[PDB]
């Protein structure tokens, strides 16, 4: 029902997005690692070592994709 | 009901908008594409290439037009 | 019963206003132009040709006049 | 019954506060000029003319005063 | 029940803590004073003669100590 | 339930995390100490003397850890 879940749910793992949040916090690219929806978190991750991002979807405003 | 629903229902698909968000995250010029409403969705992509942004509707403040 | 209704119904349409939102986007010297309150909007627009702003008013903080 | 409301009625008029809102904006040293409680509208004025400020009072984070 | 009113009931009077804000404004050193619980307003004051702070319990996100 | 409290019961004292809030506050390298879920506390700390931070579990966006 919600739109984040949706627009998370669909995303194949290993492609690359850039994710803006409801606090204005930009994150850049990003490659998109797994989202499990029966507790609503989605695992990403960006090279550093490797450095692992876990944020929560419920408050997360929007996704964009590159080509 | 929502006026974020309505400001993006009726507005034509390739028009530039400008939009600002409830993050504060000011959205330069973007060429409309699509809004499907049963699930609350709407698609902006500016020129990179090209960059396709995925926003939620229920969070989104305000829209610009330019004439 | 929402203030924000109320300082929007009231205001004639051609004064300038400045009004901040929640976000804290700082939207300059602005004359308004109208405020349609069965589904809540707010039209304003400023110099640019010209650039016409719509905004939600349930999501709208304050508005400031000057004499 | 809200904070907001009970820092805001007996606050006599004439003297300089300075507000803090949600969204961060501060507000400077402007002078407190009513607070109509009935539908919640504090009335504020810093000098520019008079710049008059219309800010909702539900949506006041903090009040500072000075001695 | 709300962790705010427990972080600031057993805070004893005197000890200078720093307090980040939901709005992200960040407030330096400033020694607490007193809080009352049965109306959740928490009263602050630093050096300026005296600048005293009133903010809003609910709405604070959280509180930092130094030892 | 809420994905906060996940994220937070099962990290192990004494690993570092850096965390992010709905504020957009970004918290630097701060190594985590504990985490009582009764009441939904964080308790975490860096190095100053030591400084002890206090922050709300409910109002915490994102945690990311380093390899």
Request: overall charge negative; hydrophobic content about 45%; charged content about 15%.
């Amino acid at each position: 029902s919600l739109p984040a879940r949706w627009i998370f749910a669909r995303i194949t793992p290993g492609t690359t997005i850039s994710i803006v949040t409801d606090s204005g916090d930009m994150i850049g690219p990003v490659v998109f690692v797994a989202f499990c929806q029966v507790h609503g978190i989605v695992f990403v991750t960006q090279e550093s070592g490797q450095a692992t991002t876990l944020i929560d979807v419920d408050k997360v405003e929007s996704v964009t994709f590159f080509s």
